[PDB]
Amino acid sequence: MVDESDKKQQTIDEQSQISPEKQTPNKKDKKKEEEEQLSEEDAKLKTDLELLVERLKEDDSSLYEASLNALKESIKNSTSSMTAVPKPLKFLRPTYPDLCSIYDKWTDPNLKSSLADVLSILAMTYSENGKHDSLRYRLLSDVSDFEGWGHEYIRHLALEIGEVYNDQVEKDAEDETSSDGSKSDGSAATSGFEFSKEDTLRLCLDIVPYFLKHNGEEDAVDLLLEIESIDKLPQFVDENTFQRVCQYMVACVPLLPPPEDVAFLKTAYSIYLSQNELTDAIALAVRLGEEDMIRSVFDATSDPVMHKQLAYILAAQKTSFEYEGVQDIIGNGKLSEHFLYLAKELNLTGPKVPEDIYKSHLDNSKSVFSSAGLDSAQQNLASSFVNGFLNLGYCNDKLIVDNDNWVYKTKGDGMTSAVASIGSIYQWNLDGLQQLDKYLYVDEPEVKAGALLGIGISASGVHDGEVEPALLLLQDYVTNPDTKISSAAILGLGIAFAGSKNDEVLGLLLPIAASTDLPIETAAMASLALAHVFVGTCNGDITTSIMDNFLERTAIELKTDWVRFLALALGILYMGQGEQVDDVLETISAIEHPMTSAIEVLVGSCAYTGTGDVLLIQDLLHRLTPKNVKGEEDAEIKSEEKKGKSSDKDATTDGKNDDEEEEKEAGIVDELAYAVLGIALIALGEDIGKEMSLRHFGHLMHYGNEHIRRMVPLAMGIVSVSDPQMKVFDTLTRFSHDADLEVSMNSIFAMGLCGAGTNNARLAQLLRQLASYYSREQDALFITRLAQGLLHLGKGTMTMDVFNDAHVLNKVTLASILTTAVGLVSPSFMLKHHQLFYMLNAGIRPKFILALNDEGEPIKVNVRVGQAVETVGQAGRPKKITGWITQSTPVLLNHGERAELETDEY
Amino acid sequence: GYDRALSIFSPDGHIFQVEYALEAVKRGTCAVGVKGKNCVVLGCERRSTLKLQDTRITPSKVSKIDSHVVLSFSGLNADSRILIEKARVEAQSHRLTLEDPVTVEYLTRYVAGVQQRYTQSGGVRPFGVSTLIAGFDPRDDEPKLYQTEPSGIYSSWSAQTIGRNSKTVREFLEKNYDRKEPPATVEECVKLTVRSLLEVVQTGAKNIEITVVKPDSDIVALSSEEINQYVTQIEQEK
Amino acid sequence: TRCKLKLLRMERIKDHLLLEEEFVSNSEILKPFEKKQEEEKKQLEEIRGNPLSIGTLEEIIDDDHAIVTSPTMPDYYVSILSFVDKELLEPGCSVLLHHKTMSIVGVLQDDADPMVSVMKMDKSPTESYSDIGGLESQIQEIKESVELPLTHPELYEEMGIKPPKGVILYGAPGTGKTLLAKAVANQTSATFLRIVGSELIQKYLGDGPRLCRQIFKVAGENAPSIVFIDEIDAIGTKRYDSNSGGEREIQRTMLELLNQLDGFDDRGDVKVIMATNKIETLDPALIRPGRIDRKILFENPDLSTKKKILGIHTSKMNLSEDVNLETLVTTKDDLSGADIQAMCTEAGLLALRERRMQVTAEDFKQAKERVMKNKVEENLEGLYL
Amino acid sequence: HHTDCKFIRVSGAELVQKYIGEGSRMVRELFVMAREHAPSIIFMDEIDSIGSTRVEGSGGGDSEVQRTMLELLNQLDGFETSKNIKIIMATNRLDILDPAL
Amino acid sequence: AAPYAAKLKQTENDLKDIEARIKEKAGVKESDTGLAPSHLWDIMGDRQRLGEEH
Amino acid sequence: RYDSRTTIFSPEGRLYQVEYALESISHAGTAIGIMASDGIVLAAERKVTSTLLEQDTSTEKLYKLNDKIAVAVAGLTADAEILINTARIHAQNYLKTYNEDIPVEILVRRLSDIKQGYTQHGGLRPFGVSFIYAGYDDRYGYQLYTSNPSGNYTGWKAISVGANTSAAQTLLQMDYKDDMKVDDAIELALKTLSKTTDSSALTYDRLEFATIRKGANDGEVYQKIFKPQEIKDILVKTGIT
Amino acid sequence: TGAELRSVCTEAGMFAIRARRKVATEKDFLKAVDKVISGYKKFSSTSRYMQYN
Ligand SMILES: Nc1ncnc2c1ncn2[C@@H]1O[C@H](COP(=O)(O)OP(=O)(O)OP(=O)(O)O)[C@@H](O)[C@H]1O
Numbered sequence A: 001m002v003d004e005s006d007k008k009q010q011t012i013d014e015q016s017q018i019s020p021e022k023q024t025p026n027k028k029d030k031k032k033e034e035e036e037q038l039s040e041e042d043a044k045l046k047t048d049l050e051l052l053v054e055r056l057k058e059d060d061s062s063l064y065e066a067s068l069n070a071l072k073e074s075i076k077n078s079t080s081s082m083t084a085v086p087k088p089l090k091f092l093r094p095t096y097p098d099l100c101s102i103y104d105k106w107t108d109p110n111l112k113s114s115l116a117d118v119l120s121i122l123a124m125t126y127s128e129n130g131k132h133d134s135l136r137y138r139l140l141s142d143v144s145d146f147e148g149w150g151h152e153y154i155r156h157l158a159l160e161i162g163e164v165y166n167d168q169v170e171k172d173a174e175d176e177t178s179s180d181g182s183k184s185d186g187s188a189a190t191s192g193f194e195f196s197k198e199d200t201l202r203l204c205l206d207i208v209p210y211f212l213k214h215n216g217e218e219d220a221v222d223l224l225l226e227i228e229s230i231d232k233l234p235q236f237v238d239e240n241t242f243q244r245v246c247q248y249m250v251a252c253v254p255l256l257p258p259p260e261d262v263a264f265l266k267t268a269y270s271i272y273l274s275q276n277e278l279t280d281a282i283a284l285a286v287r288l289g290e291e292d293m294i295r296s297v298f299d300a301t302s303d304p305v306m307h308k309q310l311a312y313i314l315a316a317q318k319t320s321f322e323y324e325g326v327q328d329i330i331g332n333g334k335l336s337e338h339f340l341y342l343a344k345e346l347n348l349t350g351p352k353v354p355e356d357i358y359k360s361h362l363d364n365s366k367s368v369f370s371s372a373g374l375d376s377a378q379q380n381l382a383s384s385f386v387n388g389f390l391n392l393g394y395c396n397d398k399l400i401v402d403n404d405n406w407v408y409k410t411k412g413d414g415m416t417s418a419v420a421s422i423g424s425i426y427q428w429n430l431d432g433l434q435q436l437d438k439y440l441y442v443d444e445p446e447v448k449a450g451a452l453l454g455i456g457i458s459a460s461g462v463h464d465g466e467v468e469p470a471l472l473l474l475q476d477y478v479t480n481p482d483t484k485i486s487s488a489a490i491l492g493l494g495i496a497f498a499g500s501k502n503d504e505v506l507g508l509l510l511p512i513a514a515s516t517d518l519p520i521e522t523a524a525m526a527s528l529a530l531a532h533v534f535v536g537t538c539n540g541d542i543t544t545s546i547m548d549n550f551l552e553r554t555a556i557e558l559k560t561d562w563v564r565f566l567a568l569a570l571g572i573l574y575m576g577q578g579e580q581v582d583d584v585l586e587t588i589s590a591i592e593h594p595m596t597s598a599i600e601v602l603v604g605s606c607a608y609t610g611t612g613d614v615l616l617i618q619d620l621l622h623r624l625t626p627k628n629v630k631g632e633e634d635a636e637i638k639s640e641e642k643k644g645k646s647s648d649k650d651a652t653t654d655g656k657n658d659d660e661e662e663e664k665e666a667g668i669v670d671e672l673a674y675a676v677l678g679i680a681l682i683a684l685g686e687d688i689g690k691e692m693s694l695r696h697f698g699h700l701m702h703y704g705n706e707h708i709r710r711m712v713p714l715a716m717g718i719v720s721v722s723d724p725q726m727k728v729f730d731t732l733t734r735f736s737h738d739a740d741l742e743v744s745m746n747s748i749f750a751m752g753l754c755g756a757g758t759n760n761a762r763l764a765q766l767l768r769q770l771a772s773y774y775s776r777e778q779d780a781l782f783i784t785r786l787a788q789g790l791l792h793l794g795k796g797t798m799t800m801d802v803f804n805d806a807h808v809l810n811k812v813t814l815a816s817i818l819t820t821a822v823g824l825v826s827p828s829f830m831l832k833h834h835q836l837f838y839m840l841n842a843g844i845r846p847k848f849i850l851a852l853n854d855e856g857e858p859i860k861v862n863v864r865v866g867q868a869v870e871t872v873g874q875a876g877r878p879k880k881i882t883g884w885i886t887q888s889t890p891v892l893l894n895h896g897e898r899a900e901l902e903t904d905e906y
Numbered sequence B: 001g002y003d004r005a006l007s008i009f010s011p012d013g014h015i016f017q018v019e020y021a022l023e024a025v026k027r028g029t030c031a032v033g034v035k036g037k038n039c040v041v042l043g044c045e046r047r048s049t050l051k052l053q054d055t056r057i058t059p060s061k062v063s064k065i066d067s068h069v070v071l072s073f074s075g076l077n078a079d080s081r082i083l084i085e086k087a088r089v090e091a092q093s094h095r096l097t098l099e100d101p102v103t104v105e106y107l108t109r110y111v112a113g114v115q116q117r118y119t120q121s122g123g124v125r126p127f128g129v130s131t132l133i134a135g136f137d138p139r140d141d142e143p144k145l146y147q148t149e150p151s152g153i154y155s156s157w158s159a160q161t162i163g164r165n166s167k168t169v170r171e172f173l174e175k176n177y178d179r180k181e182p183p184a185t186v187e188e189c190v191k192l193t194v195r196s197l198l199e200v201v202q203t204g205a206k207n208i209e210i211t212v213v214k215p216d217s218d219i220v221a222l223s224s225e226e227i228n229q230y231v232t233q234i235e236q237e238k
Numbered sequence C: 001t002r003c004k005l006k007l008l009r010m011e012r013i014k015d016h017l018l019l020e021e022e023f024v025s026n027s028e029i030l031k032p033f034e035k036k037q038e039e040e041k042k043q044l045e046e047i048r049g050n051p052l053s054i055g056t057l058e059e060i061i062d063d064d065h066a067i068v069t070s071p072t073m074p075d076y077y078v079s080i081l082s083f084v085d086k087e088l089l090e091p092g093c094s095v096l097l098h099h100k101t102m103s104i105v106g107v108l109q110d111d112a113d114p115m116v117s118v119m120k121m122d123k124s125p126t127e128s129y130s131d132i133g134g135l136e137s138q139i140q141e142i143k144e145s146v147e148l149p150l151t152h153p154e155l156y157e158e159m160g161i162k163p164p165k166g167v168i169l170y171g172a173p174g175t176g177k178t179l180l181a182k183a184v185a186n187q188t189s190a191t192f193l194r195i196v197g198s199e200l201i202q203k204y205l206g207d208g209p210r211l212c213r214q215i216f217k218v219a220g221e222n223a224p225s226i227v228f229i230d231e232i233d234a235i236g237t238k239r240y241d242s243n244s245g246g247e248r249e250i251q252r253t254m255l256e257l258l259n260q261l262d263g264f265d266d267r268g269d270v271k272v273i274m275a276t277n278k279i280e281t282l283d284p285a286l287i288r289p290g291r292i293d294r295k296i297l298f299e300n301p302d303l304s305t306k307k308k309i310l311g312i313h314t315s316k317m318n319l320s321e322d323v324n325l326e327t328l329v330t331t332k333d334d335l336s337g338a339d340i341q342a343m344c345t346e347a348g349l350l351a352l353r354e355r356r357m358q359v360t361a362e363d364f365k366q367a368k369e370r371v372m373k374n375k376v377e378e379n380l381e382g383l384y385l
Numbered sequence D: 001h002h003t004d005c006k007f008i009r010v011s012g013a014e015l016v017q018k019y020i021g022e023g024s025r026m027v028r029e030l031f032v033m034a035r036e037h038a039p040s041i042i043f044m045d046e047i048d049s050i051g052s053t054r055v056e057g058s059g060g061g062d063s064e065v066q067r068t069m070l071e072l073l074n075q076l077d078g079f080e081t082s083k084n085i086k087i088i089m090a091t092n093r094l095d096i097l098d099p100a101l
Numbered sequence E: 001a002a003p004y005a006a007k008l009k010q011t012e013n014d015l016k017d018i019e020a021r022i023k024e025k026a027g028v029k030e031s032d033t034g035l036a037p038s039h040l041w042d043i044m045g046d047r048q049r050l051g052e053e054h
Numbered sequence F: 001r002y003d004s005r006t007t008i009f010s011p012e013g014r015l016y017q018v019e020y021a022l023e024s025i026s027h028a029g030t031a032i033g034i035m036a037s038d039g040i041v042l043a044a045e046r047k048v049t050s051t052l053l054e055q056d057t058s059t060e061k062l063y064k065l066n067d068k069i070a071v072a073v074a075g076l077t078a079d080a081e082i083l084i085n086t087a088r089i090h091a092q093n094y095l096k097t098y099n100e101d102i103p104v105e106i107l108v109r110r111l112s113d114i115k116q117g118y119t120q121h122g123g124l125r126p127f128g129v130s131f132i133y134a135g136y137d138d139r140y141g142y143q144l145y146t147s148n149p150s151g152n153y154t155g156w157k158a159i160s161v162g163a164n165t166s167a168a169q170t171l172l173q174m175d176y177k178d179d180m181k182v183d184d185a186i187e188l189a190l191k192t193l194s195k196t197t198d199s200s201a202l203t204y205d206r207l208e209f210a211t212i213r214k215g216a217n218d219g220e221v222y223q224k225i226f227k228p229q230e231i232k233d234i235l236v237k238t239g240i241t
Numbered sequence G: 001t002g003a004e005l006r007s008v009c010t011e012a013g014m015f016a017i018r019a020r021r022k023v024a025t026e027k028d029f030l031k032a033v034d035k036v037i038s039g040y041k042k043f044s045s046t047s048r049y050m051q052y053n
């Protein structure tokens, strides 16, 4: 440390720690006197650089501060940075750390502020040279140690981030602001940013985003593509490159509003397409929900290869996975055109092959019955629906149904729903139609109507490849003029095809849903079906649906139930879009009535989705407003008010739900809790409002996919035994279902306690009974999620009928609706060319470790479990493939996706 | 338990002094024996304590008792030293009586004999040394390998390992070795020994020592160079 | 950095918005029910006066009376009457009297002891599940007897019979046993009691078994619950005193365990873990099955296993600059996973002398030598040589 | 003085507890007091000659005080941000100590 | 250490918000059980309350 | 616990009594042999001293066991005394029987048995003596060994026993030279003895010295014990005094 | 003991869970007795002089 002169080279370094003699006196004097000596300075630049490098090891603040103190002055005081033009410019390399030594190493508040601005200007000017990049680089990849450089190099980087962000917030931009003093664009700092990005991608992960989001442009992202696609395999493996990429959309997912968010996700998709794995391509293409992106990956395997190969099989598998059926329709017909084989290809794309795999799983799971033995009165009706709820999905319980005794003892609306429940036994199955047919050609019209509902449910698993579509059966019934028959028919058609907007299906539903002049309560099903059809894909925001809603309001207001169902139907229709839904909010609000305001708050949720934080505060101010107004005083109307209040509560919950799925992923615990308290505001603000908020809570949880499932449903349940409306329990159980008999036991004991214990109305009893059977499927037969499973940020289309029903007081008519509850998840199995129905081994993982993921790319350690197990729900969701030690290679990466495994053994 | 003294038995029937005697064997250097069909190779780890240790005059871990029986040890080095000398007075004495050189079968009994004697008594501790005695008979040419243990129990093994992480070498040996065909070439059998010893040294080719007994009173100690070539064959293939 | 932010994005917004909600909502809870709830508040208020004289309940006779013994000293023959039930009153509870006439106006209190603090843990471990990595065959064993019959009771009725009671984790030191108890209890979210077996010996005579009554009295109320008795090896030859702890106590504390864990009491639905480094130290009747069922033996981690354990520790670290990481594992044979955590401790200590902030590959090799020298004594190769 | 910690000397004593009155279940208590007055240095002097019935116990009970203190300290490593409550152990020679201290 | 260091600092601000929520939430309590039957006992008990025989 | 008699082992296969006997050694002064191909120096340090302790009339930490093998002693001098007599008696027994002055190996091996023997048999105490054996035999030339109290031996190029064994060993191997000189070997022994020993000045009277050489006149073997004055002079040369 | 008899039933039953069979059969009883007898010697004291002979 102490000076020891020029005795050896070691002690020269110690000499310049206190006072440099080759950077301070000599150089200073030299610059301020002769200008022949500019030639001597140029040679001495190299020497000066070395002395910095050697003393980078030293860290103490005092011996960098004072040492380079008079050099820091010289910039403006003696040199003025223009006494020899080129020469001070290229001698800015040692002087730039001198400035940083007062910024970061010493903290003097007055100088730390002031010299931040100075650093920005000189960074820009010296990046013209391209030597400011090299200045950053020697500290980024390091040469020596000190505490100092590790904080210092960022100060240089931060200058760039500073300016670019500011040009958006303040419209003036450029060097007109004195907060940087550096121009925003221009070919002098643009080339600096590109070069900086290269070094920082290799060694860090840093400034590469700050630049993207601050530019605000997809262009920034498309530059990124170029550099990364080189890096894809030689610099580091495919996997490492990917973790950056799916992240590209996710970190700023919850902070790109609609036009930005879509434009960025286009680029991540394209990066994946360029790289080796098309498996990563399909996942992002589904995300966007655009028809165009789906087609491109499907085409990429199918069209170039003339031969059948792996390629045709792989295409079919990828499109099959979405059980929306949006991908299914699009991908079909290319298989027919190419014509290698029709028979295998068409079936494999359709959900027909998913029926066959279910049988293999079912064999393990067997059948255990537990259905209620009660008969007579409303208890007969309760038990017959309960049988269907326990045998959801493909199950065989033929003989019980064939005993027509209990079937015929149902009466009224009970008959319709009884026939519908029979259909859910053969849910996702071609056979079952026989049982329905018997009733349909005999007795009163009531059983005829219920048959059509059951056809709907059964047809879910078979409606593609032109193999018994729901359309075929149900067209005849629509033609028939009776209201009960036609209403039932179009409800079932919507369910079966789900998100598929095939020409025949869509175009049948196109002239209709435009009569609401005639007063029919059960014409809710008119719009309700069409809304269901629309979800799963981008929405035209159809003119048929918008027109009829307005017309209904003109015609009637007597049937309160009718207009409430209608309001929800618009909001569900617009799901699968948010860019276009900003427009239609204004369109609805053009015509203003207090009744119309109820519709608006629902549609606000969809428009603002995946962006809601302005939406959240809005849906809370709304809640406050009735009471607030009463406050003011404290110091026909019936129908309009009630619609107003109920809509808001539903809207609040809906906003939260869609938002929590797409967004980041930690926050999921928290969003459930926002409901408990919404209810709490409600717990001493509206008495009427409490009734609605109870029912909403359960579907809040199911939609949101909460991490905690043990404590919260059970605790809430106890309070709500006292409170009226037993439909609260039904909504809780749809969440609790999870992986069966983990979560769902506590629910069976708890719900069973209130139900068995208290009888004081057979009406109250009925709701409680149905909920209990729903929760469990025997021996983990299937699971239900609202989410796709293929994406855990996804949202289904079949589960939207579940979401609809919790907005209204319980009714016998509503019971018919509740039979439908479709939303199946398939159990993965390793496939072969002979279509092997067994998985070898898998790792299952409760909680991802990785802080390099949210979703969690499954750890390679896991806990090992056997063959042929259902894809586990929460506390099991990350799934890694064990097959590598028996040396099998997945073709289709599986992270806990719905998607069936496929392996190639060599 | 009943380690307060040697003569008192034990509810558990195990004399503790013998059990602890075994434990002491693990202190000392690893030694391994492997028989061929025409060879026995007796190798031992020769662990170097410091670089000031001579190779001029410092004892080898392997000691010839007589001119055709060879002996290695594992254990308390102090104790081994008198055990080897006692073995030897008898061994030579075997010729005084019979005018026949020392038979390997008579010799294992004797070494087990001095040891058994010390255990039986109460006013001596047992030897904390298990030994491997390798050799052939004078009369015949079939390879013979014996062991003595502290206890005073002796066995024959095809190949056997003792001292310093003995377990890990024992398992290694099972997998490599074949009892259907023991190696019938002296070189390949040596190579099996080297591979074993590699493990316990971790790194060394100047700390592996190999000795060989061959029939008709051939005993040789292998060059440090010669062992390094075998290590060279083993590192390349791996 | 940008990966960290995705996580940081959800976490901030969602909870801080709920905080802002709850704050406003304190008022709001009163507003929908203010004539059932304030009606109830009124009637509560009227009968009980002020103050509320706290007594401690000795016992009730079931007929609508009780005998209480206050701390203020007088005993009183009270009535169980009004806003109180016979099921809510159980010995050792602290009951609320109205002062001017002792009528039991409610119970709002059961615990306030310093004692129960001891048993409970306010825990936050820095290593949770899947930093137990490797030895996975035998973590699967602790799962089956602790984690998985809590998580699905389904499986243990599908097979029928009782789910196996308890476990003993036992073997060599360093084999990761501690981290197992703390990490399987992270998974379940069951009440983790923790007491050491050097804290089961007492410096007062015959209070030792009273303490052992406290552990499963606590366990049984907060159940489902995982009771860790850490180091129950210290029962056989480690004792605080001899004329005020003595020989009687050591045996009695073990007799006490027997009655808790499979005595009449039985105390079903407490999963018990016992870590002990030697099972030949332990009592023959406490290593009786059907109170601790199967035993899991651990051994000094094997050569492939120590790869796993090296990756857990050097994931924190700045990695090797030249890389020799795979050869570190090879040199070690018959060695603990605690040697691995003492090796990355030892690498960054050599680094700490320089007070440099990076770590390089060469520190690894040095650090392994340093810490192997510490292990081996000068009388081991004194006794031997 | 440099770190600014309360140097709290512990020794197993019966004088540091007016409530339980012994140093066996005052290992738990030590952590909570030192947590109020953090950062702190815990100087548990294992003298192993302090007692009169502790020394008769097992050669010294003070080793037992240290083994409980370690583990307790292990499960909360980030209860305020890192550690804070430093366990300074001290003994004459390490012969006198256990293989698990 | 700016890329991880800044972000680490925001994580500590989050925790403090959470702890504050437990305190905010705990502020209703209000846990007196006696139910619907004991609404009769409160009339009965006003007469026992001015009773000198208890 | 196991700190008793010699028959009994510890369950870790340790005889505590050999381990303690080692530790006896470092409570008596430092003793160093350094081997060189020009000769061996043996150098020793006094355990303690006073100003009227006579130590210029006799040695008592350097004994000749014969006319070609001599020993430095570190440890209890009482235990040493009996073992030196037994060694010396044997040294002449070998002389009588074979007409050769006893080989270095036969003499170390004998005494290793004897030390071992007092531990192994009976109730007798083990010995707590480290002898640095420095000899000549016409087989191996120059030879250094040292024997543990444990009753085993190892050959050396340098060794230190007695107090401060670890440090004294370290400084020796730091500056050791493979061929060395006899003269340098004497210098390296004073250099080490200074830093290890807690006496303020290193005095001739705290030193005993003997050298065994065949290079001080060949044909013959000359054992040269340094007298006080020779010791006193060589400190000067190395500039400690 | 009948505690060991409970360790054949429990031990045969966790092999039922892992195989993904719901029932128990005879073969899994065979492994279950062998695991409990053989494991019992290890916990208990045994330090024989018959580990080389
Ligand atoms: N398989 C493993 N995976 C991860 N870390 C491991 C593994 N095994 C050991 N460790 C590490 O070694 C550390 C030290 O071991 P730990 O404190 O758990 O002791 P133990 O074997 O129970 O000893 P005792 O209970 O006798 O004091 C662990 O905390 C953990 O960091």
Ligand SMILES: [Mg+2]
Pocket: C177, C178, C179, C275
């Ligand atoms: Mg432990």
